Amino acid sequence: ELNENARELEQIKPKIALQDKEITSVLSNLHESNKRYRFFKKISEDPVKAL
Amino acid sequence: YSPQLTAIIGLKSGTSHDAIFSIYKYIHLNELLAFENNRNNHNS
């Protein structure tokens, strides 16, 4: 049973690695779009000082 | 087991492990402990 459980863990791990890669990618995209949001908000709230 | 053993432990037959474990429990129970001196001597 120990060997069987080890086998099933080793089978389940790769999908988890792939999903972690995707999670980090999405987090970086979220950071970039937050940058853009802050930019556009600053410009719209006080345009002359922002420019 | 030999009659000198089954007298100490109420068991006719067992593996070597059982006899060793029970003998060690016996010498520890009577505080004969790494030198040990008794009933095991005169029996065995």
Partner: protein
């Protein structure tokens, strides 16, 4: 939009381990059987 994507990915990740819990739940049945066997032995030795 991106936040919803993140949440979906994380739930998908949790589902796999929640499924993997069941085998570890079966080893418990193994241990239970072994305990009952040791109890058999203790009972019979007490009767002896």
């Amino acid at each position: 939009f991106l936040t919803n994507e993140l949440i979906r990915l994380q739930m998908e990740k949790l589902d796999a381990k929640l499924n993997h819990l069941k085998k570890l739940e079966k080893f418990m049945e193994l241990e239970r059987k072994t305990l009952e066997r040791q109890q058999e032995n203790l009972l019979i030795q007490r009767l002896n």
